[PDB]
Design a protein around this ligand. Sequence first.
Ligand SMILES: Nc1ncnc2c1ncn2[C@@H]1O[C@H](COP(=O)(O)OP(=O)(O)OP(=O)(O)OP(=O)(O)OC[C@H]2O[C@@H](n3cnc4c(N)ncnc43)[C@H](O)[C@@H]2O)[C@@H](O)[C@H]1O
Lengths: 230, 233
Amino acid sequence: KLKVEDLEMDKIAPLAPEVSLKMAWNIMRDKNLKSIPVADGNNHLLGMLSTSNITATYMDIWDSNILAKSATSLDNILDTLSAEAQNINEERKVFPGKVVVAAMQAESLKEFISEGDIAIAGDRAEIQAELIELKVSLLIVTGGHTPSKEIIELAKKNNITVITTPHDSFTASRLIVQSLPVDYVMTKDNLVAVSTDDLVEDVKVTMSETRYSNYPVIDENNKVVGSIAR
Amino acid sequence: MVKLKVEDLEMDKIAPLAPEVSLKMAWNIMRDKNLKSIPVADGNNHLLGMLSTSNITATYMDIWDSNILAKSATSLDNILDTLSAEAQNINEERKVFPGKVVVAAMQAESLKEFISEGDIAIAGDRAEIQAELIELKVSLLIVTGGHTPSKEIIELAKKNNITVITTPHDSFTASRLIVQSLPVDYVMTKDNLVAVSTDDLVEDVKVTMSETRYSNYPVIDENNKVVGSIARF
Ligand SMILES: Nc1ncnc2c1ncn2[C@@H]1O[C@H](COP(=O)(O)OP(=O)(O)OP(=O)(O)OP(=O)(O)OC[C@H]2O[C@@H](n3cnc4c(N)ncnc43)[C@H](O)[C@@H]2O)[C@@H](O)[C@H]1O
């Protein structure tokens, strides 16, 4: 009897779970993939990423602490904003608060911005200093202007991560969402894969139900070996 | 020979989207009706194109044209809906907002170096800022925080014919949401959309479907009205 491993399959390089949506989307376009598997370091299938996932994330109610819940990393934020770090709290993995644009006056920031927040700000030293004083978990300086040495020093002392992006505040706000790791967004449950072990006749029965265009293929050990079209 | 035509097949009747409908509204309809795509049609219900999550993603993920409101002729209505905003003044002779979207974070005097006649400015409660934005002849003033501006500012707007609206959202949120106001016809697949006609023979549509491997195809009738959608066999 003919098994799935006897079928020719599409080759498919899985995404790591920690890769940004930005990186993931660039890969999906580059290969013309509507969806792509996500796998761990041992190549075990973790989930699947598609533009259905990505759009739902963008269109559906934004959790305020989404960076925290996704455990979005600094490297993800830095690549996504084409940003450079002027100081890093190297003992922090996770940015716990909400993302806020520091559009206000310095004296007013207290009311909107609190400890652990991610603050997007411009090139005003006065504003930066106050955000540092408020213990934002992350200060994102927009406009491409790296803060003064004084500000950098204040941040070193307080262990505030400070980065600078060339993008203005509107664009940075749009971009930051694309920092999210794929594992936060992907389909995980009732992902339908097929095993190299499975009989084709049985797989026809399983494809009958589901209606998807593509199914990742796994081996005896749950490792991602490819995908096949219906 | 009597041959099976598309009209003989089972098809999904989908009410098509009007082209001016916002991405936000489109997606709510799509998500509700469990669609992965949805046809876009003109007033005579002729096919203009198709919307999928691939179009939407590509547009949302592309941050490179700060001028997309202009290029897309996004309507004030769409923006109002998307930002749950209310208008305080409207320039009735303007259909199009021609500049760039910009968060007005700076101090009043500095606004003039980033913000330019025709721009779309996202601004806070500060009346000083609101009035400089109006003097700079922004095409659209969006006030954040649900802070409907003062009667003074509204009258300054009236005089200079600056459209002004107010959203409950803060500036980060307004920035993140505003691209959802784009009309579907800016975003939809237009070129190389593959449709089938009711009177097409199923035989010949089987070939077409093998040449292109899309999962669904819009069906148009013998007078070119959108009559629904058929699944790949
Ligand atoms: N006639 C036409 N002419 C011109 N252009 C056209 C066209 N038709 C479509 N296009 C354009 O081209 C794009 C791709 O077209 P299509 O190739 O038709 O793809 P699709 O059906 O829209 O997406 P997909 O194949 O992933 O849907 P599925 O049910 O498998 O999966 C749906 C979702 O479920 C999830 N999923 C997928 N596989 C899964 C699995 N094995 N297990 C669990 N979940 C899975 C994924 O999140 C996925 O997003 C479209 O976005 C559209 O813009």
